[PDB]
Design a protein around this ligand. Structure first.
Ligand SMILES: [Zn+2]
Ligand SMILES: [Zn+2]
Lengths: 172, 77, 56, 115, 107
DNA sequence: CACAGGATCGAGAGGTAATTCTGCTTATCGGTAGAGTG
DNA sequence: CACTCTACCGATAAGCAGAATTACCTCTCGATCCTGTG
């Protein structure tokens, strides 16, 4: 409760046949109780600051917000999901295309080592290689990553919408 | 063992191209090498009595190309 | 336990032992007694350290 | 709250605005400048508590699960002597212990709330 | 003695300790609504004069610092208006003896 | 035929969970009265 | 009478540092190389 984090969902991805990576993708909700923010931001590896999930979704090719909302929740009658996701779609207006999403991601990467012409490549490489390195590591397969991110956000919202129980660490 | 061998078995060094291309690996029965050089089969009782290590050597194929089995160590069994 | 049914609130399924030591225990109450003993051992292990520090 | 308004053109959503000129409420995409009549007396709604009638997802083939206990309560619709029951799936410390009986035949849900 | 209603201004608190040797004490109506002396957990406090303090120190052979201390901001000290160096006498009731006397210095 | 002395570990990253309740220090905001006018 | 910052303290919020019962018994290991030399 004292922490400004209400609920957090993370997956510890790894490769069973390739080289060991152990990369942690952390998704946290900053809306502690009724703080009126209710914003969710993922923790991309090698980036020290949390980016809102809308920018990540846009960087994967899902530019329109309606498609992102459809990906997050598979039912239209669950209005509570849309109500909690409204701050996210409101905060996603800073980025309106894939290019500006990549620019934003790259601007939060290296400490201004070089101009922005390399930030796009940096973001593309980071998302292709160390963004969930267990579904696929090739190019052009961003739809699966977007779907898995939507599933993770749906699970986090379900846990935060008093519909499920917090996962148990002692389950064998 | 085979996966780790044929996982990253390529170190390109540079028409001047150098490659190693490590091949398949071979595991033999445990053996012991002494001062005189004669090699004989090592048994667990002898290894325990003589404070030796019950390990077997590892052999892998190396096919260097420019553009046989070699000893790389002993694996305890 | 997997041997019970979902949403069961009967005393037997929730950890109530009906038999005595002389009569013998069924596997379920045996497991429950094992859990209780484990809790007791953990409590003693933690309590001895905390009490030692407090006494010092 | 019924449904988040989405722009027919493009795919973005329509924030709401007031047509005081015609004193009206019009939803605007404010990206492609698409405005419709937007006839709705509700703008926002917040729900403090959770009701009890949500039951569960009641997905089909619910009788295939062997872990759900079986009872003999009579179904109000088809008057069957077989059914399954489960507690409310809302996970909090204030939910009641009312059982939600599900009829395997005729796909009917009836609660045990005899209050 | 000055009693305000809700809050005290720090600017006025700055000049509160001025104009010596007169002492100005500030109190709050909310704190003064009820009396804390009448509480069963608060024993009797009796102020000691200079001669009494000197006699006590001589009899017990103690220095000023070798005594229990009570803060100047303590509610009982504010109630009695204790100053620095003033010794108060506390009479309590114990389960081992009928009466017990303790002395504290406002430091 | 043969010996000797100074330093791990490197751009690259990240080799990585299991602890908290104090107290101290260093950012941060959130307030509140004046130096003289039309 | 409030106009703009100037000087004051009162909250809030993140980073450090310590420290974790006592006594006793047994085994088991490790205390260094290679580029540079005559
Ligand atoms: Zn539109
Ligand atoms: Zn029925």
């Amino acid at each position: 409760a004292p922490s400004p984090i209400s609920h957090v969902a993370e997956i510890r991805s790894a490769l069973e046949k390739g080289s060991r990576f152990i990369s942690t993708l952390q998704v946290k909700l900053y809306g502690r109780e009724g703080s009126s923010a209710r914003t969710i931001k993922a923790t991309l590896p090698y980036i020290k600051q949390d980016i809102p999930i809308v920018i990540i979704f846009r960087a994967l090719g899902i530019i329109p917000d309606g498609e992102i909302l459809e990906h997050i929740c598979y039912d239209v009658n669950d209005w509570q999901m849309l109500e909690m996701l409204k701050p996210c779609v409101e905060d996603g207006f800073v980025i309106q295309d894939r290019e500006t999403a990549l620019d934003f991601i790259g601007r939060r990467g290296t400490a201004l080592g070089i101009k922005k012409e390399k930030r796009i490549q940096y973001a593309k490489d980071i998302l292709q290689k160390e963004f969930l390195p267990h579904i696929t590591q090739l190019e052009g397969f961003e739809s699966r990553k977007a779907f898995f991110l939507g599933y993770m956000i749906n699970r986090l919202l379900l846990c935060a919408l008093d519909r499920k129980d917090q996962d148990d660490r002692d389950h064998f | 063992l085979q996966d780790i061998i044929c996982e990253d078995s390529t170190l390109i060094l540079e028409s001047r191209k150098y490659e190693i291309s490590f091949g398949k690996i071979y595991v033999t029965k445990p053996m012991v090498n002494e001062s005189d050089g004669v090699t004989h089969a090592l048994y667990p009782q002898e290894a325990r009595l003589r404070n030796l290590t019950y390990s077997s050597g590892l052999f892998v194929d190396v096919k260097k190309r420019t553009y046989g089995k070699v000893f790389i160590g002993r694996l305890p069994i | 336990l997997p041997h019970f049914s979902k949403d069961d609130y009967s005393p037997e399924s929730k950890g109530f032992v009906e038999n005595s030591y002389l009569r013998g225990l069924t596997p379920q109450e045996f497991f429950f007694h094992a859990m209780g003993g484990r809790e007791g051992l953990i409590d003693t292990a933690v309590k001895t350290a905390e009490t030692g520090y407090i006494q010092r | 709250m019924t449904t988040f308004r989405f722009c027919r053109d493009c795919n973005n959503m329509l924030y709401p605005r007031e047509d005081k000129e015609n004193n009206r409420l019009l939803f605007e995409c404010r990206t492609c400048s698409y405005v419709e009549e937007a006839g709705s007396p509700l703008v926002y709604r917040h729900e403090l508590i959770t009701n009890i009638g949500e039951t569960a997802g009641v997905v089909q083939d619910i009788g295939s699960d062997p872990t759900l206990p079986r009872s003999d309560r009579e179904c109000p619709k088809c008057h069957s002597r077989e059914n399954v029951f489960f507690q409310s799936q809302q996970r909090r410390k204030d939910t009641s212990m009312v059982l939600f009986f599900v009829c395997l035949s005729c796909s009917h849900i009836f609660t045990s709330d005899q209050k | 003695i000055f009693v305000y209603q809700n809050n005290i201004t720090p600017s006025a608190m700055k000049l509160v300790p001025s104009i010596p040797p007169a002492t100005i004490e500030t109190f709050n109506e909310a704190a003064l609504v009820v009396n804390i002396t009448h509480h069963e957990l608060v024993p009797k406090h009796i102020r000691l004069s200079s001669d009494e303090k000197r006699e006590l120190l001589k009899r017990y052979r103690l220095k000023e610092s070798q005594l229990p201390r009570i803060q100047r901001a303590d509610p009982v000290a504010l109630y009695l208006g204790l100053k620095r160096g003033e010794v108060v006498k506390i009479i309590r009731k114990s389960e081992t003896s009928g009466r017990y006397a303790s002395y504290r210095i406002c430091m």
